[PDB]
Design an enzyme around this catalytic site. Structure first.
Site, PDB file in Angstrom:
ATOM      1  CE1 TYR A   7      -3.308  -2.649  -0.073  1.00 48.91           C
ATOM      2  CE2 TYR A   7      -4.058  -1.930   2.467  1.00 48.91           C
ATOM      3  CZ  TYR A   7      -4.698  -2.714   0.843  1.00 48.91           C
ATOM      4  OH  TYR A   7      -5.439  -4.004   0.704  1.00 48.91           O
TER       5      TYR A   7
ATOM      6  CE  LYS B   6       1.068 -17.896  -2.845  1.00 50.19           C
ATOM      7  NZ  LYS B   6       0.495 -19.465  -1.973  1.00 50.19           N
TER       8      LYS B   6
ATOM      9  CG  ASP C 203      -1.888 -19.681  -1.055  1.00 47.15           C
ATOM     10  OD1 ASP C 203      -1.423 -19.484  -0.594  1.00 47.15           O
ATOM     11  OD2 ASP C 203      -2.147 -21.147  -1.414  1.00 47.15           O
TER      12      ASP C 203
ATOM     13  CG  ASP D  65      -7.234  -4.268   3.636  1.00 43.88           C
ATOM     14  OD1 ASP D  65      -8.421  -3.941   4.287  1.00 43.88           O
ATOM     15  OD2 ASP D  65      -7.163  -4.031   2.381  1.00 43.88           O
TER      16      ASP D  65
ATOM     17  CG  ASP E 238     -11.737  -5.934   5.244  1.00 45.27           C
ATOM     18  OD1 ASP E 238     -11.631  -5.877   6.165  1.00 45.27           O
ATOM     19  OD2 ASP E 238     -11.586  -5.745   4.108  1.00 45.27           O
TER      20      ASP E 238
HETATM   21 MN   LIG Z   1      -3.305 -21.754  -3.227  1.00 48.71          MN
HETATM   22 MN   LIG Z   2     -10.650  -3.351   3.761  1.00 49.59          MN
END
Ligand SMILES: [Mn+2]
Ligand SMILES: [Mn+2]
Ligand SMILES: NC(=O)c1ccc[n+]([C@@H]2O[C@H](COP(=O)([O-])OP(=O)(O)OC[C@H]3O[C@@H](n4cnc5c(N)ncnc54)[C@H](O)[C@@H]3O)[C@@H](O)[C@H]2O)c1
Ligand SMILES: NC(=O)c1ccc[n+]([C@@H]2O[C@H](COP(=O)([O-])OP(=O)(O)OC[C@H]3O[C@@H](n4cnc5c(N)ncnc54)[C@H](O)[C@@H]3O)[C@@H](O)[C@H]2O)c1
Lengths: 347, 350
Positions: A140, A186, A218, A242, A246
């Protein structure tokens, strides 16, 4: 003893904040906390009074305090105005001036409240997970970043001191809960992932008290739908944080239940996830659970009073069963539900 | 009809064999001229050749019209150096053929709502195809690297890259409910903003198709609260990895999720699940994801849509009548494959 800046702002903010104070006042009296607070104009309630969103006495009553109890800001009367004078960017100035790098959001499905969740009861039972999200870095705010006719780019970057400090917070939060942290990166594909993992591992060395485990983003999304009750504290970078906070925020099944804390260098900020809600503003129906639970958070994270915050939590959990608000299918107005929280807190 | 079968590791061979059994049955009934050949890949290939993606398998893949693929990996291989990871073998397969579009449907079959992590009311009617960009984005973008001080990766797309994966999702929606959700982070990121403007540009070529934009964080809320509202979803590599993985848990058993990867070279068809070593060689694996993958194969590689839908009919019915253990039933891989073949014969002799 307990110095607190209260910024109620706009809409339901004042209502739900006043509810939290009743709870704080009830505590101070019965427990002797030496609560000192003052009320400060903020957002559109200040744009009307100080031609600005985040004014002179507020900027400074913030720096002066040991914590900030925030309501919510924005509304109908303040739409389509400059980035300069905007209520929603008063939020951003407030949060920046204190250099708040860590966002803590708990999603709790309270005993008896399983029916509310979009997950089946079995899965929803006993979910209480604190997502800790790095807030001032990552993709960001990363560079290089730009765009042309032909392409666009953005950079997910993290340095050692940025990961360390957020990870300590998560580790410190875990000591006060169930001593289990899951770190989310990741690492199987990205250099940043692998850097993240290794740094959090280095920090973990100082907390053998805490169980540490690593999940890829993921696969973390599979786990929070499939078995969210398995987690305690979860820490991660900004964009993943984020995304996944959420995701976790929907598990309880009502927005009016969600508290938020933001920690860092300066004065910490405790606030409801929800907005100023001008659609139900001043109808005496706004669910104050989020702000009260924000007051609980303020007690555990700014003042050290962990047993006290658990009392506010337990009071609130009992009340939601006894006299549920309209957003829960219930019928109890803000005032009546606050009184329900106090009955349980007076016992 | 020329297929390359890459059985793989664990349950991979088991479920791929059941898929082939369904294919030979179809070849017999319909005269497909099916020709196939079995190749080492993943851990299997590492044992025999020392690499996950050998030249012999590269050549088989390059020279067939479609790949039917099981799954790779297991404790015998997982933590190996990168040059020779089962996972690396996968990336090499996809890059060799330039398979930029990963199609992953998540479906809650009529009568299987009880299986979902979601409440029955919300799992009802779910059928969402996530179209994920596979060859680009942050996962392959440069600059990248790490030092003692910091680490960096680069989320980046170019115009012809967004365009082609976009085209695939509009074409997919056109043969469905005609609704595309594009997913970005346009509100914070330049790349989001470019993604969005480019999809809109492609959207004008499909007036019959309704196009809507959602942020990834919001999408992630929406796929849990109201997933049945979606038809096709298109997005970049990392967001696609995340959201399609999220959607993959909604049906309630990883045994049920097929996928296709489509691009310039030979298309690859594969179950979404891993090698399930906990159950491998026990004869209980659910062959649905593999059978559905072979059905995706028939439509996207060979234009046999009406066949593909027949296969999905026989599967859906078998799920209800004789469920496998991962659905609370007792039907082993072979026993289940037979039930499917019987519903195939029965619906066809009408
Ligand atoms: Mn995956
Ligand atoms: Mn958000
Ligand atoms: N964190 C924030 O400060 C924040 C977040 C989102 C929106 N907003 C702002 O607030 C205004 C309203 O936007 P919004 O409606 O999307 O946010 P919102 O949270 O106020 O509205 C969300 C929905 O849930 C309901 N709701 C919210 N809080 C509730 C509560 N405590 N009890 C019962 N019901 C509740 C509202 O009535 C509304 O229908 C806008 O100006 C927006 O920009 C602020
Ligand atoms: N596409 C791929 O090749 C792929 C995807 C994910 C993981 N993996 C690899 O496979 C292994 C992962 O094991 P895992 O447990 O994390 O994921 P997994 O998908 O193999 O197993 C997850 C769970 O689902 C069950 N399951 C999966 N498929 C099933 C089926 N068809 N029928 C019945 N039950 C089924 C398994 O027994 C297990 O309990 C690792 O070696 C990993 O690298 C490969």
């Amino acid at each position: 003893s307990m110095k607190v800046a209260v910024l109620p702002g706009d809409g339901i903010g004042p209502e739900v904040t006043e509810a939290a104070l009743k709870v704080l006042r009830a505590l101070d009296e019965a427990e002797g906390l030496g609560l000192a607070y003052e009320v400060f104009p903020f957002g559109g309630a200040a744009i009307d009074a100080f031609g600005e969103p985040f004014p002179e006495p507020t900027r400074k009553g913030v720096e002066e305090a040991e914590a900030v109890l925030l309501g919510s800001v924005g509304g109908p009367k303040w739409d389509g105005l400059p980035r300069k004078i905007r209520p929603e960017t008063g939020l951003l100035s407030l949060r920046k001036s204190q250099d708040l790098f860590a966002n803590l959001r708990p999603a709790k499905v309270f005993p008896g409240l399983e029916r509310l969740s979009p997950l089946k009861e079995e899965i929803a039972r006993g979910v209480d997970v604190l997502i800790v999200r790095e807030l001032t870095g990552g993709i960001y705010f990363g560079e290089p970043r730009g765009m042309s006719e032909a392409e666009a780019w953005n950079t997910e970057r993290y340095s050692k001191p940025e990961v360390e400090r957020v990870a300590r917070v998560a580790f410190e939060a875990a000591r006060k809960r169930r001593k289990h942290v899951v770190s989310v990166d990741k690492a199987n594909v990205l250099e940043v992932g692998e850097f993240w993992r290794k740094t959090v591992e280095e920090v973990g060395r100082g907390y053998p008290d805490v169980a540490l485990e690593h999940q890829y983003v993921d696969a973390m999304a599979m786990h929070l739908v499939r078995s969210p009750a398995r987690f305690d504290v979860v820490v991660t970078g900004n964009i993943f944080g984020d995304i996944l906070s959420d995701l976790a925020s929907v598990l309880p099944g009502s927005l009016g239940l969600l508290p938020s804390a933001s920690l860092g260098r300066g004065t910490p900020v405790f606030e409801p996830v929800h907005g100023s809600a001008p659609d139900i503003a001043g109808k005496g129906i706004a669910n104050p659970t989020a702000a009260i639970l924000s007051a609980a958070m303020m007690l555990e994270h700014a003042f050290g009073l962990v047993e006290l915050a658990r009392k506010v939590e337990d009071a609130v959990a009992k009340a939601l069963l006894e006299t549920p608000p309209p957003d829960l299918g219930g019928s109890a107005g803000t005032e009546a539900f606050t009184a329900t929280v106090l009955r349980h807190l007076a016992a």
